Amino acid sequence: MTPLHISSQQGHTRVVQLLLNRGALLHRDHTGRNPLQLAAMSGYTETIELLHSVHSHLLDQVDKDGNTALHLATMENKPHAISVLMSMGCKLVYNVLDMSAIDYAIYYKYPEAALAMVTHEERANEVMALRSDKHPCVTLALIASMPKVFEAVQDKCITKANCKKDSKSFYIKYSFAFLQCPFSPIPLPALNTMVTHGRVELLAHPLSQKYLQMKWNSYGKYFHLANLLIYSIFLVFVTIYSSLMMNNIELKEERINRTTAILFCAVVIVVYILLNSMRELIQIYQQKLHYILETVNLISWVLYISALVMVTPAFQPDGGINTIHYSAASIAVFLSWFRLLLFLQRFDQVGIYVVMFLEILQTLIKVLMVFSILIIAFGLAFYILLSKIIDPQPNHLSFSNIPMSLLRTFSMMLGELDFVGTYVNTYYRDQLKVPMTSFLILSVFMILMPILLMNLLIGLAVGDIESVRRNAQLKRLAMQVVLHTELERKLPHVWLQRVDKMELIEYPNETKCKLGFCDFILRKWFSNPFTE
Amino acid sequence: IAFGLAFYILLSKIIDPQPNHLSFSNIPMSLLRTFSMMLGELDFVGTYVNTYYRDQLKVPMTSFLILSVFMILMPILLMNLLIGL
Amino acid sequence: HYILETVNLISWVLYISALVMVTPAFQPDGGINTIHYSAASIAVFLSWFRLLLFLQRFDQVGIYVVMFLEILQTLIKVLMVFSILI
Known part of the structure; x- marks a missing residue:
């Protein structure tokens, strides 16, 4: 270092002013840095503006590591010396490790030095289009790492006008340019990442709400209703068919009489399954590895096979009914209605009570596999x-087998110990x-299975109802993201990308159109984004 | 339902309707009886075990499959939802 | 600590009961009676209740045996005080 390096590093402005007027020449030190790299490492933004006015060429030259003056002020978190180096026209080039200026601020986790770059007035959308190697998109990397910073980027996408807030020419502009990032176009890229890490403050922000209300009004309100009304035809023609089979079940082998009402119902079932299997086979062609992972598709294959085995004796020459047709009927009627609870998660007033039911069902599978030890x-x-027992009375027959003694143990932690019948009556007659x-295994049974285990399952189903009423706002908004994701995963691309907008201009003083009665019904019993 | x-x-x-299977011989009666055995009285010995070892x-x-998934979720899982609410 | 620690005292009721269970497989004729059914059921019950003490240290399902053996410590202090009412 020369004395021009040392004086400018410490920020003594009157000394660097003196050395310049007496012809202190400029050259690098042993690291490679000029006098403005060093004054930018420290936070002295009075000495940067002096040296740039005299020698303007040394703003954007690099040291031996390839760093500019903007990398060095970012590596040690000087946010006041970044807003000055960008206003003068730094060049935003890459390192020798191929790692830009904004990369070091989201990698060392410096939220102050990354807020001074993506909120700059002139040069905001030149640092959010860098597309480095460690980070391929700056939008998807601020939602993961530093979510307080991206809330201050959404504030600058809502521009107002200056027309006194109640005139007839006051517009408020929303700009969705950062929520749709082209680098496989996954449908909602910047909102599937908010729900993966669970950012509720970035989903309830008034830019994300208008981004969903642009999509609810466009396509996504007609194609939830048109998925429930297609299923409620298969629902009705299964319960009608099983109810008719039970009356028309006469003898002679047992044989049904194929009337023109169970033959009409057996055709509507078998034609629904083919047309809703050729929608499955399309979804197999792209999406192989989630059929292990996702459960609701695997339910629909046990349902569709069972409804096919149910309708077979309406097609044979004589109705061949037997045990395997009553088995497939009851699984088809039970799974047709348990599938209906999966559509009622998305209603308005009564939807939260099926979220609570399917979360205390996930806990009670992990508990009833660990404490399947105590049943064994x-x-x-x-x-x-x-x-x-030397005379098996028909109350001790339930214990004459190893799988039957595991059912009977599970159905006497629910209340019916039968203490008088199979322990007292069979004791005073010497049996x-x-x-x-x-009386010892039973006395330690009723301490811990019907008291201690059944109060564990009550104490876990109060902490999984309180932790749904706590984060209910995240649970509602994550339904609408995952709805619109898979909905436009199926729609054709030609009239998908021509119906969205890049920016929404809204006039909050004009006489709005009154709401239609068809649109008013769709807002009462669907989880819409219009409940802000 | x-x-x-x-x-x-x-x-x-059931080929000999004993007066414990008569509550399931009807569609509205099987909806009362299902609601009054999430309250405790499954009657497991009477209508599933006695009528099985005599081939009825x-x-x-x-x-035993619909019953084993019954007592997981109606008298355990639903009745602990109504306590937690 | 054999007065103080419980899991060692469980392992001595388990090991004695499994020895009394296997005695009629070693006698000249198999001498089975009431005291061999008694030691069999204590050995089968304590072999699996000991297995819950090893599952405290698993990852996803380990916390549910910590909750089971803490509400068992309270329910011994309660079911000795309110053994008055019985």
Whole structure:
């Protein structure tokens, strides 16, 4: 370092003014830095503006590592010396590690030095179009790392006008240019990342709401209603067909009489399954590895096979009914209605109660596999003690088998111990095989299975209802994102990208059109974005 | 309605209707009886075990399947939703 | 600590009961009676209740056995005080 490097590093402005007027020449130090790199490493924005006015060429030359003056002021978090180096016209070039200026501010996690770059007035949308190697999109990297910064980028996408807030020419402009980032066009890129990391403050912001209300009014309100009314034809023609089969079930082998009402219902079922399987086979062609992962598709294959096995005796020459047709009927009627609860998650007033039901069902599968130990622990222990009763009365027959003693143990943590019938009556007439231990395993049963385990499952289903009423706003907004995602995953691209807009101009003083009665019904019982 | 129809399919055509299977011989009666056995009285020994070891239960291995998924979610999972609310 | 620690005292009721269970496989004739059904059921029940003490240390499902063995410590202090009412 020369004394021009040392004086400008410490920011002594009157000394660097003195050395310039007496002809202090300029050259690099051993690192490669000029006097303006060093004054920018420290935060002295009075010495940057002096040196740039005298020697204007040394703003945008690099050291031996390829860093400019903007990288160096970003590597150690001087946000006042970034807003000055960008206003003078720094060049925004890449490092020798191929890592830009905004990269070091989202990699060292400096939220102050990355807010001074993406909120700059002149040069905002030249640092949000860099597309580096470690970060391919700056929008999708601020939502992951620093979500307070991206809330201050959405504030600058809402521009007003200056017309006194109540005149007839006051428009408010929304700009969706950053929520749709071209780098496989996944449908809502910047909102599937808000819900993956769970950012509720970036979904409830008034730019994201108008981005969904642009899509709700466009296409996404008619194609949820037209998915429920197609399923409610398969729902009705299954419960009608199983109800008719139970009356028309006469003898002679057992054989049904194929009337013109169970033959009409068996055709509407078998034609619904083919047309709703050739929608499945299209979705198999692109989306192979989520059929292990997603459950609601796997439910629809047990439903569709069972409804095909149900309708087979309406097509044979004689109606061949047997045990395997009652089995497939009851699985088809039960799964047709349990599928209907998956469509009622998205209603308005009553939708939250199926979110609470399917979250305390996810916990009770992890609990009822861990504490399937205790059912095997007792169910074997009652099979040892209670199976060799010398006269099996039809209350001890439920323990004469190893799988039957595991059902019976599970259906007496629900209340019916039958204490008088199979422990007291069979003891005072000298029939209980091992007396003083049968009252020991039972006395430790009713301490911990119907008291201690059933109060564990109540205490877990109060903490999974409170943690839905807590974050209910995230649960509602994540339904509408995942709705519009898969809806335009299926629509054709030719009249998809011509109906969205890049910017919405709104006039909040003109006489609005009154709401149509068809549109008024669609807003009462659907989770719409119009409830702000 | 999902279970009450499903028990009407499996349990209505028992070849000797004992007065514990008469509550499932009708579609509105199988919707009362399903609602009054999420309150505790499954009657597991009376209408599933006694009528199985004397060869009277019509479809055996599925009647223990709908019942085993009944007592997971109606008298455990639904009745602990109404306590947590 | 054998007075103080419980999981060692469980392992001695388990090991004695499994020895009494296997005695009629070693006698000249198999002498089975009531005391061999008693030791069999305590050995099968305590073999699996010991298995819940190893699942405390798993990742996703381990917290649910911590909750089970903490509401079991309270329900012993309560079901000795309110053994008066019984």
